[PDB]
Symmetry: C3
Subunit: 269 residues, 3 copies
């Protein structure tokens, strides 16, 4: 895929306005919903065991996030995932905090055993503890803590689970069983807005609802989000993280196809 192609998937999402069902944490519910609305999609949050199966079956995509998990919410995520798997609705997982505490690592591993996933998104450490692999990294600072080792972790995980693995960082690495790509987009102010990464996972869900190949959907989602963020930072930079949060939402609704073609960097490895 290329910048031109990613830009086309963005226009598709806006034309179809897919329904994205989220079972997420309570620190990012409002931001995630506002971001999806700004982008042009339709968000819906539902967590009760008596309704998740019914809501998941009528959605375009299902997004699972364990940020502030509980025994009952993990049980609901699995019931919802099974329902989506039965009706052909792509499911995306964000294993927030996997590795930080055993309860999170356990819940993450349980979900991947019971639900077939179209994609998994998180930092290096979160992905390694979820799949149970090697190569350890949190995010990195400068120079280079290892690029080939991250590329290797991504491919190994993707091959074992037969899904798409997107490891985010200053440089994004995305891969499926037989392909690997590195992405250069975004701005550091995204680290000062809670839920920024989570919103990205939901946007990936929106793109998967309109593009059949999950690898292409993920690449187009991450490239579009990153360009919106950079353009927002240019207008937001020395004002602060408060103004950036608001301008990010504005840009998610005004970013064009030409913008993505000009500022998104996609490289096949």
């Amino acid at each position: 895929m290329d910048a031109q192609s990613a830009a086309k998937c963005l226009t598709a999402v806006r034309r179809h306005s897919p329904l994205v069902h989220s079972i997420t944490n309570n620190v990012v519910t409002n931001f995630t919903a506002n971001g999806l609305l700004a982008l042009g999609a339709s968000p819906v949050m539902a967590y009760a065991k008596e309704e998740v199966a019914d809501m998941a079956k009528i959605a375009g995509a299902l997004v699972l996030n364990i940020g502030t998990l509980s025994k009952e919410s993990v049980e609901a995520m699995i019931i919802a995932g099974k329902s989506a798997n039965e009706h052909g609705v792509p499911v995306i997982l964000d294993p927030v905090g996997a590795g930080a505490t055993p309860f999170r690592t356990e819940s993450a591993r349980d979900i991947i055993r019971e639900v077939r996933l179209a994609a998994i998104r998180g930092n290096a450490a979160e992905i390694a503890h979820t799949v149970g692999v090697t190569d350890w990294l949190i995010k990195g600072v400068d120079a280079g803590e290892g690029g080939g080792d991250i590329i290797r972790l991504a491919q190994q995980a993707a091959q074992k689970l037969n899904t798409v693995i997107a490891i985010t960082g200053e440089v994004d690495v995305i891969a499926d069983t037989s392909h690997v790509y590195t992405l250069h987009n975004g701005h550091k102010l995204l680290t000062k807005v809670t839920g920024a990464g989570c919103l990205l996972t939901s946007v990936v869900g929106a793109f998967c609802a309109v593009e059949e190949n999950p690898l292409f959907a993920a690449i187009a989602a991450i490239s579009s989000y990153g360009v919106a963020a950079q353009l927002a930072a240019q207008q937001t930079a020395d004002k602060g993280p408060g103004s950036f949060q608001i301008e990010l939402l504005n840009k998610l609704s005004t970013v064009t196809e030409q913008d993505v073609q000009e500022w998104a960097t996609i490289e096949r490895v």
Copy 2:
């Protein structure tokens, strides 16, 4: 009622600063509270069964919203409603998603059987499944999917439950047992801000706390909110949904009596 009268109820709300108790969904808690504070009221959220009855009895109004309901939260809403009914505190209901899943339709019907309501607010479909009536509509696009049929649904529901029914849309229809009105106010950017409709339901609650006739309170609440939204969009328009959300809050605190008299359209049918 007229624009002049609606404008007077707004000044009343600001003078009394009523305490509005909300039992709502976790996607709109922060926005709903900030909007009520901006308007000039006092919000309070409490959901535990061991305290809802005590909190409801000291409030000026009670607002129930099933956006992200659970078995226990529906039970709490009913305990709270019964307490308010015992101490003369008006109760308002927003049956979010009624009809979307059977669990939501069931919970909505259970609440209206056990609690006496001053008003119910939602779209056409939500109102029809909650009361169990005819006439089906989601929101409409252009031309006219039927105005008289919506007017009929509103009056039928209002007569059966002896309460006020407010069906929102590009054109708002409000009615009680013997009166019907259509309202023309607002801006479409309200559809790009999550919780915008919910905030409106809470504002109706604030107005009911200071005006004895619930039909008049609802008309004045919806007219004032809509004018604040239009004035915000004029200053927010080509910047985006992010800037609009912030300007809506600003306008809820600066909108005047003259503003409402000039831009709110109220028509008795």
Copy 3:
């Protein structure tokens, strides 16, 4: 302590970026996290009984808030507090609504019996019902409902629990077993932003993670927050509470040491 000293603790917080674990209400989760990120700290929310002990032990500080409490969340706060007490992590408590309903007063008293606290923050009424003392006051209006009586309540509570007591109001009163101070900072627009007080409690937590004497940490935290708020209001004033919320976040990230030295008023009694 003085303005010069408080300013130094601010730079410390930004250099260390402490991890602050919050077990709080769902009306202020997003705002609290964004404020901590803006300030320069690292927030983490976790509420499940199967993980709070593990998360608390690796944090720099623990913050407990009963704003929208439940039977299970109070149980979790206590398990988390015990763990922090075992690993030397300072714990801060915000007894939101203590006195409003017996369930809140009871839960607040249970926490102070089971957990050793570095500090407690709330209004006069909340502090009196939590500790079970005299002197009653909500916030005050003008003239003077009693300054010496508030000073007395603070010292009595601090002596009995051997902790720091911070009673907020137009004038802030902070004290420990043998010292008392009054602080003059902030702006009234903080009352129009939900979670403003709660964010302050979390900021106190961030400062306690880097300064050994909790009294000094609290003084420096409250002075810095108040100066950021005043500077934001100067740029936000006649636009509204919406713009202020956003500018407050901006200022929490741009406020300097010189700013605090110039606009914070600290007086030892």
